[PDB]
Design a protein around this ligand. Sequence first.
Ligand code: CHL
Ligand code: CHL
Ligand code: CHL
Ligand SMILES: CCCCCCCCCCCCCCCCCC(=O)OC[C@H](CO[C@@H]1O[C@H](CO[C@H]2O[C@H](CO)[C@H](O)[C@H](O)[C@H]2O)[C@H](O)[C@H](O)[C@H]1O)OC(=O)CCCCCCCCCCCCCCCCC
Ligand code: CLA
Ligand code: CLA
Ligand SMILES: CC1=C[C@H](O)CC(C)(C)[C@H]1/C=C/C(C)=C/C=C/C(C)=C/C=C/C=C(C)/C=C/C=C(C)/C=C/C1=C(C)C[C@H](O)CC1(C)C
Lengths: 56, 46, 221, 219, 219, 35, 112, 51
Amino acid sequence: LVDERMNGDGTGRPFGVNDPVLGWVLLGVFGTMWAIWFIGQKDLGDFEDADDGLKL
Amino acid sequence: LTFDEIQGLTYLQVKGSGIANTCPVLESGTTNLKELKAGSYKLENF
Amino acid sequence: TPDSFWYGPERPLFLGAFTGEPPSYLTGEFPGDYGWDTAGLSADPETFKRYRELELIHARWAMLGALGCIFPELLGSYGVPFGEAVWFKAGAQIFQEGGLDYLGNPNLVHAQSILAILGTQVLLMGAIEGYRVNGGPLGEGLDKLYPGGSFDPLGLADDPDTFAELKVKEIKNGRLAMFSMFGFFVQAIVTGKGPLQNLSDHLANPGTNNAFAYATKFTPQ
Amino acid sequence: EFYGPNRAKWLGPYSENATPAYLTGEFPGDYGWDTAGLSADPETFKRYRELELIHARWAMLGALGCITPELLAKSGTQFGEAVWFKAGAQIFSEGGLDYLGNPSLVHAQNIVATLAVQVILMGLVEGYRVNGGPAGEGLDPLYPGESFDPLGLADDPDTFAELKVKEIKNGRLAMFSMFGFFVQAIVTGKGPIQNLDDHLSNPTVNNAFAFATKFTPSA
Amino acid sequence: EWYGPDRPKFLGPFSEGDTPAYLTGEFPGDYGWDTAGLSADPETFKRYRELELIHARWAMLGALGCITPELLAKNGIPFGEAVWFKAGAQIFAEGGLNYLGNENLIHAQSIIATLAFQVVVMGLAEAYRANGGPLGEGLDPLHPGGAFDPLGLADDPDTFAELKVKEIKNGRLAMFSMFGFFVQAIVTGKGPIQNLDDHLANPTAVNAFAYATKFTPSA
Amino acid sequence: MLTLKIFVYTVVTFFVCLFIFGFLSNDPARNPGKN
Amino acid sequence: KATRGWLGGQGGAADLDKWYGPDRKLFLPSGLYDRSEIPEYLNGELAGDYGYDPLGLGKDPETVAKYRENELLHARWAMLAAAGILIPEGLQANGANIKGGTWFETGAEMLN
Amino acid sequence: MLGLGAWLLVWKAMYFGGVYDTWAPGGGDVRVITNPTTNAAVIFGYLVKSP
Ligand code: CHL
Ligand code: CHL
Ligand code: CHL
Ligand SMILES: CCCCCCCCCCCCCCCCCC(=O)OC[C@H](CO[C@@H]1O[C@H](CO[C@H]2O[C@H](CO)[C@H](O)[C@H](O)[C@H]2O)[C@H](O)[C@H](O)[C@H]1O)OC(=O)CCCCCCCCCCCCCCCCC
Ligand code: CLA
Ligand code: CLA
Ligand SMILES: CC1=C[C@H](O)CC(C)(C)[C@H]1/C=C/C(C)=C/C=C/C(C)=C/C=C/C=C(C)/C=C/C=C(C)/C=C/C1=C(C)C[C@H](O)CC1(C)C
């Protein structure tokens, strides 16, 4: 046909991914920043006992 | 896609794909162009 | 042993509450001690040291193996043109016409001779498996299982409270991977497909595509 | 006899130097057979007696239950599948698994249901065997006898030690016969009573040597 | 050399670090290879040396008994079957199992006769080995001597310690070659000399990797 | 166009994961009021 | 006898303070039926005592005990009755050749 | 309670007379839903679909 499309306007794809690299973008960027948060979780407090939130 | 490959899809599968904007390619059949039988034909799905 | 929740007398055990007293030589000292020695194979405290240093090597190879068996089939499902994306067919890539292409790419590794692969492997593994026994360039006198130094460049084993915690994570990730790599073995023998294909076949219909689909498969006569 | 040094042995009369030192004869079934030295540590030899007796009590339940569905099929009871290594697959049958032949009985259809019920039920009673449960808490790990000897047969400890030997010798035979049933199904392909019937029919040709060229690698 | 710490190791220079401490070098064939730890109990370890040597001696009679009917069929002697893993089927043939090819020889017909002979015969000899009897009573079960050393070579323990090392290393080659013969018969289906000859035809193409795709699963 | 879509999905998921793990990184304790 | 827990730890008879004494379950909750309106002869001495006697049929603990022998026999027969009525009808409806598993016509099924 | 309440709709559609299917062949009427879709790729495909 005349031009080139991505062809996903009304297809209902999961999180709008149609190249599998887009799903690894979703997992890579979430996973990179989950890991930065997880390693940095030692500076956030060890809320280990049961009554250890901001409560009233 | 051929004509039968289009008609073997439901409406929600062909929707939003751009397949609906295309003519069916004629994958079977040859370029001999003579075994077309002479005479009149009413021409649908043109 | 510290108050690290995974060590000592009040530690989690392999039957939960139904385990009773653990064996007397499983004092909660070494990581992953769920008190599971029902066969009594490690009652000798010297064989128990050998089985510990044999479990963890099995664990570290199976953790590499389980990641190494999912990863070419996961990318193979996403259009990467492997010769055989399935792991138990991945050996036969050396026997096809173009040889063995890493990532299915012809101008990557491009192995053609399997005798060159094995001849390289025996020389390279034999050098480094012996380094694991004694000495070596990356560390000479270290622990047999947790050498550190050059094998801990990020320093993630400095705090011995953290280090005794991460050893529990290593053995539980390892025992899960050994138990899953055994799953890769059996469910490739029984079914004949890749483990990510067995997963997606199970997800498409869990009522029929469970393991009872192949229960009559090895029936005699 | 069966205890002390002056007991029966695994080589009989030619066994006076064959038996090791630690196999004294204070445990039942001790004919002094540890030819590979596996049970030299008494901590592991304690574990292997638990492994032997529980295997014996599962094989006696095995060898009786691998046989009575095939006898009653010779007596005229329709099971669907009466041969023991085909009797698991009859839950996938069109009417499911009726117990003897009655659809008024169990009539199970779902294999994942009867397995998950089993994992919950057997996960508790095998846990009761280890730590204790409703039938006892601090008994012998192999011979509880409080709720598990209701008929009073664990009395008179002289003849009760004989019953421990009668337990393991019936049990070792059943373990030796369950290892039978597994191999006489892989090799032959027929039921063990069917293996019995044609050897009683013609003992000359219907033996294990008629199947000796089955596992030949021909390539 | 061959005893004490002067013995050579199973990993060469890489085993100078850690051998098992109980493997001191006071037994023949000790290269310090117990990475699994199966013999830290010396009562278990004395039973494993008995298992290793009897496995070694039966493999030496095995690897010679598997290699001799093939090397004599290559000369031109007519055999019922040259290869060892099809060598039991001749008693089910027409003329039965002739020894080389002749009829004044053994001429085996019944498998039940030749097995029940062996069961009572090896029942006596193996029980005599475990206990003692008509060829020695208080002798060493590993190395008896006397009637089991007729040629007078079990003397002068400086050269008898070396014959112990020559005993087990010839055996450890033979056990590795029977498990050699066992695997190459299953994977290929041809005899070991028949596997030796076509590896000498084209060594690059005909090796073990040519059969690597054989046991693949596909359903 | 796909190069733009990959880039926007790296960018948007960078800022969404800053949002999510920011409130998981002990937001309710970042008060001036003591208890 | 030593009675380890059915699922986990220590089991047996945890509290009989729901069945005997002033504190116990009743046939009406405590905001509708206090502990002074319990009849004086209904105390926490018999099993299953909920303070339930609105029609004054109990008089004293010796008359209640001789209705207790009427209650517990009527209990133990109806428990054998309830299993004897459902199970033969359930087997007949699912395939057993009982011919009369329904309870109210079993007698006339077997007459002559 | 919400889970067992959600099984009331499933039991009423599968067993207790069915529910109204406006997409039924022959026009819309009450249809017993004998084959409900338990495929996770279909069920969780609505949730990750764009709005
Ligand atoms: C209180 C309940 C409880 C029960 C019942 C169990 C039970 C078990 N845990 Mg434990 N756990 C429990 C609580 C807990 N566990 C753990 C932590 C662990 C760990 C880390 C591990 C275990 C493991 C085990 C297993 C150990 C022994 C074994 O392999 O059984 C042997 C017997 C069976 C498995 C029964 C067989 C099942 C099935 C019914 C048979 C199926 C039949 C087939 C059709 C036959 C096949 C056909 C043939 C022809 C091929 C066992 C399944 C180990 C494991 O997973 O090994 C497998 C293990 O590594 N548990 C924790 C956290 C502290 C618990 C918390 O309360
Ligand atoms: C981790 C060790 C390892 C394992 C488990 C395998 C497994 C396999 N390789 Mg293999 N390889 C391994 C290392 C290596 N291979 C190769 C080179 C090849 C080639 C060229 C080929 C194979 C093939 C195969 C498969 C044969 C099909 C089969 O037998 O189905 C039955 C078995 C299974 C389905 C899996 C069961 C695994 C196994 C029985 C249990 C694992 C425990 C082992 C007993 C331990 C053995 C390892 C020892 C030596 C340390 C099989 C899955 C062939 C293939 O891909 O065919 C399709 C093939 O052509 N391999 C090299 C380079 C020299 C290796 C280096 O170490
Ligand atoms: C002096 C005569 C005498 C002999 C020779 C034996 C010998 C034996 N008794 Mg003993 N007993 C004897 C007297 C007595 N026993 C007992 C009481 C017992 C008991 C309770 C038990 C034994 C058992 C055993 C066996 C233990 C060793 C074994 O398992 O090897 C087994 C292996 C072999 C013998 C070698 C291989 C078998 C065969 C000859 C070769 C066939 C080769 C195949 C064709 C190979 C093909 C397969 C391929 C694929 C590999 C062994 C056969 C045990 C047993 O039953 O074990 C099975 C046992 O439980 N005995 C009493 C009563 C006091 C005796 C008194 O006379
Ligand atoms: C088309 C597809 C589209 C994409 C899919 C879209 C749908 C995805 C939805 C998935 C579900 C998301 C839910 C995540 C919940 C996270 C909640 C959380 O904050 O979770 C918080 C918890 C915190 O855990 C606890 O964290 C603690 C922190 O300890 C630290 O601090 C302690 C003191 O506080 C001690 O000092 C300790 O030593 C120190 O380590 C401890 O370590 C505990 O052991 C630990 O259990 O995290 C945990 O439990 C585990 C968290 C879950 C696992 C996260 C995995 C992330 C992805 C991995 C894959 C990445 C791939 C990368 C690819 C690279 C190549 C491109
Ligand atoms: C237990 C560990 C283990 C083992 C034994 C294997 C074994 C195997 N893998 Mg797997 N794998 C594993 C773990 C493992 N893997 C893990 C953990 C991962 C995730 C990262 C992978 C990911 C993976 C992929 C993606 C692929 C394999 C492939 C293979 C096969 C070929 C091996 C090969 O090419 O090596 C040689 C590999 C290397 C030396 C490392 C990669 C080097 C690349 C080519 C980059 C080159 C480096 C540098 C940038 C360029 C140098 C330039 C040069 C001129 C100097 C073989 C079956 C290939 C295959 O076809 O299998 C189906 C394949 O494509 N593996
Ligand atoms: C969410 C609802 C809820 C909750 C948590 C409670 C909780 C309680 N009530 Mg209240 N109550 C409720 C609803 C509720 N009630 C309603 C609807 C009524 C009117 C019938 C009452 C009337 C009532 C009285 C009159 C008394 C209590 C009392 C009590 C206390 C315990 C005794 C008891 O079991 O109640 C007794 C109630 C029942 C036995 C009703 C039967 C309930 C069973 C479990 C069947 C439930 C069916 C189903 C699961 C729920 C309906 C399904 C659907 C329609 C939603 C306790 C604090 C007592 C108290 O506080 O003493 C000081 C007391 O005297 N309640
Ligand atoms: C504890 C106890 C106790 C009591 O008392 C007794 C008893 C019971 C005995 C015990 C138990 C034990 C057990 C469980 C065991 C198991 C193990 C295992 C499974 C291992 C694995 C193990 C496993 C392993 C190592 C594995 C490894 C793997 C690997 C490397 C892989 C590789 C690969 C890859 C990558 C890919 C390609 O393509 C192919 C291959 C080549 C294939």
